[PDB]
Amino acid sequence: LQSLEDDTSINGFEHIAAFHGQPNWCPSPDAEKKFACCAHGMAVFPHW
Amino acid sequence: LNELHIRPEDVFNADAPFSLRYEIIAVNGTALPPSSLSKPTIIFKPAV
Ligand SMILES: *[C@@H]1O[C@H](CO)[C@@H](O[C@@H]2O[C@H](CO)[C@@H](O[C@@H]3O[C@H](CO)[C@@H](O)[C@H](O)[C@@H]3O)[C@H](O)[C@H]2NC(C)=O)[C@H](O)[C@H]1NC(C)=O
């Protein structure tokens, strides 16, 4: 965990965690308004 | 358009000739929204 969190690049723990927050690429990275893909209440929540 | 095998007159033609899909890619990879830039246009140029 120490090594992973000290890492900063695309392998960084910070980015692997920010998948579930900001910055946002959801639904598509190119959109006027962006959200997070934390699919809540939908039928793909356990899958994700 | 020549390798696409579409003659220039086909642009004027009442048939729907084609369109273009543009997209902007940032240096760091985070593609910007297409709204940040205007709509490209197609110009014609006759012979002299
Ligand atoms: C990767 O590149 C993109 C664009 O090429 C960078 O996005 C730019 O910077 C920020 C996001 O980091 C955004 O604009 C800013 O938003 C904040 C939100 O409060 C605002 O306060 C600032 O005044 C600014 O407007 C936006 O995504 C973009 N800025 C633009 C389009 O003007 C992004 O930062 C880059 N990421 C890295 C890690 O370098």
Residue reference for tokens 């543009």: B22
How many CB atoms are closer than 10 A to CB A26? 14
Q: Is A41 helix (H, G, I), strand (E, B) or coil?
A: coil
Q: What is the DSSP letter of B44?
A: -
| CA dist list (Å): B3 to A2, A39, B6, B7, B42 | 55, 44, 8, 10, 18
Nearest to B40 by CA among B17, B22, B18, B15: B22
Question: What is the rounded CA–CA span in Å between residue A23 and residue A5?
Answer: 18
How many Cα atoms sit within 13 Å of B31 on the Cβ side? Answer: 14
Structure-determination approach:
cryo-EM
Token pair recorded at residue B48: 């002299």
Separation in Å, CA of B17 to nearest CA in chain A = 27
Which residues partner with A26 through β-bridges? A35
B30 lines ligand 1 (CB under 6 A): yes
List CB contacts of A20: < 8 A, sequence separation 6 or more: A36, A37, A38
Q: The tokens of B39 are what?
A: 């709509």
Other Cβ atoms closer than 10 A to A36: 15
The structure was resolved to a resolution in Å of 4.4
User: Nearest residue CA, atom 31 of ligand 1?
Assistant: B32
